[PDB]
Amino acid sequence: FGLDLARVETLFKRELRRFDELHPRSAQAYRENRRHWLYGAPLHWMQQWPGNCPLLVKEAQGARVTDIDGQQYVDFALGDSGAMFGHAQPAVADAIARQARRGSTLMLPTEDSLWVGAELARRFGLPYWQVTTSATDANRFVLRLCRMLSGRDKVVVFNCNYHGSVDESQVEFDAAGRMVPRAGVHPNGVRHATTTRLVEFNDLDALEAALAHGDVAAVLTEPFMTNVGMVPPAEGFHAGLRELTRRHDVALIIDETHTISCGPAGYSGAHGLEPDFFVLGACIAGGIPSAVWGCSQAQAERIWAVLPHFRPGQAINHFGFGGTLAGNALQLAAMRATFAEVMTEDAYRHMFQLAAQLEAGVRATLEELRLPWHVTRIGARVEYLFMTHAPRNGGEAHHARNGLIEACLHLYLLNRGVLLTPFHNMALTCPATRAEDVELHDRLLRDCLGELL
Amino acid sequence: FGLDLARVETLFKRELRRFDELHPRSAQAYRENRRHWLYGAPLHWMQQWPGNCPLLVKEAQGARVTDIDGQQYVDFALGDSGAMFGHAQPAVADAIARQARRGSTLMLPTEDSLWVGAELARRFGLPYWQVTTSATDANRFVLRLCRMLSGRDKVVVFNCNYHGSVDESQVEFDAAGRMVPRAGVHPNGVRHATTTRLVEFNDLDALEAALAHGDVAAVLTEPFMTNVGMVPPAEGFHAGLRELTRRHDVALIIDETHTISCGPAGYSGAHGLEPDFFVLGACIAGGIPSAVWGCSQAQAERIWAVLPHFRPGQAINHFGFGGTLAGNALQLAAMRATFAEVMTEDAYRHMFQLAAQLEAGVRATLEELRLPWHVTRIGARVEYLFMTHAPRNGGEAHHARNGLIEACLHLYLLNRGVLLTPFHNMALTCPATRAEDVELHDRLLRDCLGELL
Numbered sequence A, B: 001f002g003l004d005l006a007r008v009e010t011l012f013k014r015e016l017r018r019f020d021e022l023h024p025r026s027a028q029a030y031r032e033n034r035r036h037w038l039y040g041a042p043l044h045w046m047q048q049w050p051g052n053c054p055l056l057v058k059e060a061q062g063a064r065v066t067d068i069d070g071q072q073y074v075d076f077a078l079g080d081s082g083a084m085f086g087h088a089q090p091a092v093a094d095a096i097a098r099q100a101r102r103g104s105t106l107m108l109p110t111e112d113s114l115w116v117g118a119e120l121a122r123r124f125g126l127p128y129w130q131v132t133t134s135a136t137d138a139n140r141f142v143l144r145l146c147r148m149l150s151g152r153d154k155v156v157v158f159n160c161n162y163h164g165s166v167d168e169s170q171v172e173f174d175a176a177g178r179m180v181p182r183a184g185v186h187p188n189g190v191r192h193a194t195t196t197r198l199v200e201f202n203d204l205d206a207l208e209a210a211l212a213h214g215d216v217a218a219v220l221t222e223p224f225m226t227n228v229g230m231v232p233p234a235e236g237f238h239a240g241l242r243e244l245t246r247r248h249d250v251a252l253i254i255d256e257t258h259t260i261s262c263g264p265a266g267y268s269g270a271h272g273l274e275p276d277f278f279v280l281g282a283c284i285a286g287g288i289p290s291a292v293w294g295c296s297q298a299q300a301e302r303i304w305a306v307l308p309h310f311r312p313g314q315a316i317n318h319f320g321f322g323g324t325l326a327g328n329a330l331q332l333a334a335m336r337a338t339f340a341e342v343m344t345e346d347a348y349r350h351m352f353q354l355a356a357q358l359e360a361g362v363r364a365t366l367e368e369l370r371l372p373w374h375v376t377r378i379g380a381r382v383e384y385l386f387m388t389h390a391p392r393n394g395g396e397a398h399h400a401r402n403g404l405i406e407a408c409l410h411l412y413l414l415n416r417g418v419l420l421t422p423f424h425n426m427a428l429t430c431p432a433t434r435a436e437d438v439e440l441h442d443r444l445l446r447d448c449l450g451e452l453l
């Protein structure tokens, strides 16, 4: 990847010691938290920050975070996209506070459901919606409905996808091109040959071959892959994807959990995609676990034919989906505030300006230092990969990832006041991001790469 | 069931007309919401309230709810247990408001994680915890870890369980005693013969026969079944369950999502159970979708051997579980407030007194009217069933449920200012419930049954 991995190790060791010296109170907190949390924090992923422990946060507002050692950071991680519009958005926090004081979960709708439903239909151009407690659940429940309406069992996913803890998606290609369980993800009693057909992104011949078996209920995909570095769709790919799925009467599910960074109506709204189902995760509810999914008129009619509107005195049933806190008053209050006051044309304009500045700065550094790396941007989200050209598919992109280089870069920036999500080589801008924050990121990255070369 | 179903239908029809006359603004809201929500509300379950639409709530506090038609209710539904300690608990609402203003989701811990981890271990007597966004997910993830640590693929569940949208659990016995997909729940590409062994509750011989196959990773169960009416464990059942699972080296997972009504340490704490894993849902976080799960040190050691603590520079991985907003600052703030200020010995003392009064009143009515029905209480939760004696298992209990009778009773009470969850014949008391509220419930139920007989 253009770096001497021995030099990377040397710097990494120095930065691990620097981390220890700078963050003693977080380290002390980690010692205590390891006594009661299985992986030393409430979520096991939090153990994967670089350095010897995750930081304990004291407070965060906008794109600023302060830890319990008093260190201040510019935050380009933004809760690993869960806080994509910034921390403590005043309208959203106020809406949450107000609604908590007048009922957070009633198993009933409130007036906010009226406004939000209409807004979803307007913004995203699909007529009918439902709410879940996570993007994973939206994907799981949509897949269930697709199996119900189609009578087919398999889902098509793309190599190196991520769609949440959707067991049927947890596959990859081995060296012989065989579909096997994803590395480090136990098959969990699933026999994926019975549930899943795997294809590389940007491969219409392979997609046609998968669908031709006639056992595929749905294709599930991001419109632009974001969970193995960034893989843009090729020229003509979306047209072909949409045509092939129509020809085979297969549902097309577009997951915009990350690609909502492309604009106020997502990638689908910018590019005239025609999803059968549309999934969007928790950036919309201010840190309250949430997601929405929507469907076309044609899919709604098919769903109602297999699951009719409930009749008075009918036996109660969940039908295998929904959840007890799904669609609750608190979620809907936060969504209303977010769509009305946060996800505006002006917000996206600001985010794009700063993200374009950040992208251009990274690109200048890579070009100056002659690194065989590249940088890609989708709206507010910028990510680099350790290969010369944009990957044609997820398989290619996976080979350009390296845990040591990533950890070293991330830690070097963390120790100097910039937080990047540990799971990607990405930076996310929000309405509270400032030009000086981009300048700091740019300088530190140039400094780090400079020390390595 | 002791009632003429024809008289039940006649009253139900009258009460549906009464509902229309009393709730015109909710009906208008439903017409609008049907334009944009697939099932006319954010969650399809909300369509299953009795009456011709779900009520739209204006505000709720304690055990009081006011709808948009200005109708006031005593709430014994409490968000179908999601708000089991009452609506708008001041400490919890304040904690949510405070934390929203200083970062809701950071992919990092805060000082509240220290306090909550220690509190969970103290309260529930298991040392190691994790947080999810739902009880469903806690169950799914525990099952995954059990398959990983055991190398076995099957889970034992009990007939007429409910553990959330856990696909492997969605089975029942047919008339021939065959394990088949649960009625109305599509198998969803799961071949349950490969994932699941089904047994009736309170049947140690059948449980032994299931476990003897040597392919069971875990037994998943409520300690007292609450999702098919109430099924108490028989004398000696828990001792036998614990002994058999130990002998076969099978994980025992106790799901207290509802049975937390038994006391501040759940049924397990009251009755000295010894779970390997313990699951508790969203009642603990004030309407923020949440759950916790805990495990013994012995299970933790087996898990760490198959999923080691993360090493510096290791390739990032979700490992098939966790979630982006799981274990977030907002959840942990709400949990801290709930455990410190709400789920106290004094709160439960009040809840028990009022629930005992409610139980005694229901029992008196059933005995006076000579109905072949009975009532059961577990702590704050009271439920009746349309059979003479307590059911020995879920199979028996299922036969004593009737959608029409349930809808009629629920609607009669709703039209006279008492909300009961539409999915059960249950009432839940909280710290804000008053004796006069219980008296109103008691009178209306007696009035309704009186009109029917």
Ligand SMILES: Cc1ncc(COP(=O)(O)O)c(CN)c1O
Residues within 6 Å of the ligand: A081, A134, A135, A136, A137, A162, A163, A164, A165, A222, A227, A255, A256, A257, A258, A281, A282, B322, B323, B324, B325
């Ligand atoms: C594209 C995509 N879809 C779905 C999910 C699942 O989201 P969650 O972890 O909130 O369920 C993620 C994770 N952010 C994602 O990146």
Ligand SMILES: Cc1ncc(COP(=O)(O)O)c(CN)c1O
Residues within 6 Å of the ligand: A322, A323, A324, A325, B081, B134, B135, B136, B137, B162, B163, B164, B165, B222, B227, B255, B256, B257, B258, B281, B282
């Ligand atoms: C015993 C039990 N376990 C798990 C769940 C799942 O909870 P959720 O719908 O919040 O995932 C439920 C639903 N109340 C339940 O009753």
